[PDB]
Write a structure and sequence with these properties.
heterotrimer; A: mainly alpha; Glutathione S-transferase Yfyf (Class Pi), Chain A, domain 2; B: Single alpha-helices involved in coiled-coils or other helix-helix interfaces; Rab GTPase-binding effector protein 1 (chain B); Rab5 GDP/GTP exchange factor (chain A)
Chain lengths: ~240, ~80, ~80
């Protein structure tokens, strides 16, 4: 599939002939090296980046996450009070949203690419937004989202979580972290787990913070082009 | 007259080089905090490397805005060609 | 020529209060750095500082664009009628 995608330019087929793979076999036998190498490979080189990720992840630590598990089955005593979460699981429709928010986050570890783990953790976030929205009959507020997410990680135990989150950070293309969700939902997961070991509001507010200025940035990045053209586009009418 | 124009230039240029040095001191304390970001512990690499992507996206927009200004002006130059 | 003299004083004064302003900034950066050397959750608040710094810059760029539009707008008006 990656071969058929690369074929149909031929410079992408030169990337098919290029394969960093032998260099990976060399440097990764002694962990932080392969992260910088993959990031360098991505920096040197358009959806073919996701296809190269799709290949390299399918082919190419991952242990000791227990500390979370013991701490989660610990935190079993925690009720949606003091998480102040807007989720009322009595109504069937939200209980069904919660269940498959969890089902998603479980499904993550099973996944192929880091990006496909990212796809999972969006849908988890989306179902969380649904659980909240159906509860209060009103769209979730950003301050609501983060706690509710932990609650989904706090009950139900995704196989090998910290393994997953370190693996995604290691390689996936940080063209990720700019505008778009899967990485905003990601950084929310990080904030979630990091919080779990004993403020929340700060973590929510800070995520809102960064996400906005990145929205505004990708706007101004455009309006520059819009203005540039609009004036050039028009200086030459007459 | 010349006198207070000789001494004020002295004091003004001494104020400028002091001010500009202070700014650099500030920019170094800032960079130090940017270097306090990534470490072994209490990380959330996620948040840190978000804040990175942000400020990296803005420091291109300065080349963007500058070049937006110089490219609009080069268009003005051809409107000057109109005659 | 007191034209210069009176402008030099103005520029000197402006450089001074602006410098003091640069200093209060430097000071609090120092006061911030001296505390919680590691792991106090003060480097989350360091991340919000990087936030606000990027938020003053983002806006400088925004208002910079809007003015650039006007300068070009009225300049275009000139080169039109002239």
């Amino acid at each position: 599939e990656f071969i058929e995608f690369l074929k149909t330019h031929k410079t992408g087929q030169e990337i098919y002939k290029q394969t960093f793979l032998e260099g990976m076999h060399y440097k990764r036998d002694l962990i932080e090296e392969q992260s910088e190498c993959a990031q360098d490979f991505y920096h040197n080189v358009e959806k073919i980046m996701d296809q190269i990720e799709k290949y390299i992840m399918t082919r190419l630590d991952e242990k000791k996450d227990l500390a979370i598990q013991k701490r989660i089955r610990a935190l079993r005593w925690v009720t949606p009070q003091m998480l102040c979460v807007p989720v009322n699981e009595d109504i069937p429709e939200v209980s069904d949203m919660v269940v498959k928010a969890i089902t998603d986050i479980i499904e993550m570890d099973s996944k192929r690419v880091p990006r496909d783990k990212l796809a999972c953790i969006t849908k988890c976030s989306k179902h969380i937004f649904n659980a909240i929205k159906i509860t209060k009959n009103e769209p979730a507020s950003a301050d609501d989202f983060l706690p509710t997410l932990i609650y989904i990680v706090l009950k139900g135990n995704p196989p090998r979580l910290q393994s997953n989150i370190q693996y995604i950070t290691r390689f996936c293309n940080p063209s990720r972290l700019m505008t778009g969700e899967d990485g905003y939902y990601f950084t929310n997961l990080c904030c979630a787990v990091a919080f779990i070991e004993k403020n929340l509001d700060l973590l929510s507010q800070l995520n809102e913070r960064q996400e906005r200025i990145m929205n505004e940035a990708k706007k101004l990045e455009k309006d520059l082009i819009d203005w540039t053209d609009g004036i050039a586009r028009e200086v030459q009418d007459i | 007259t010349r006198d207070q124009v000789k001494k004020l230039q002295l004091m003004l240029r001494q104020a400028n080089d002091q001010l500009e040095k202070t700014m650099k001191d500030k920019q170094e304390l800032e960079d130090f905090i940017k270097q306090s970001s990534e470490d072994s512990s209490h990380q959330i690499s996620a948040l840190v490397l978000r804040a990175q992507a942000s400020e990296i996206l803005l420091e291109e927009l300065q080349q963007g805005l500058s070049q937006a200004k110089r490219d609009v002006q080069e268009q003005m130059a051809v409107l000057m060609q109109s005659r």
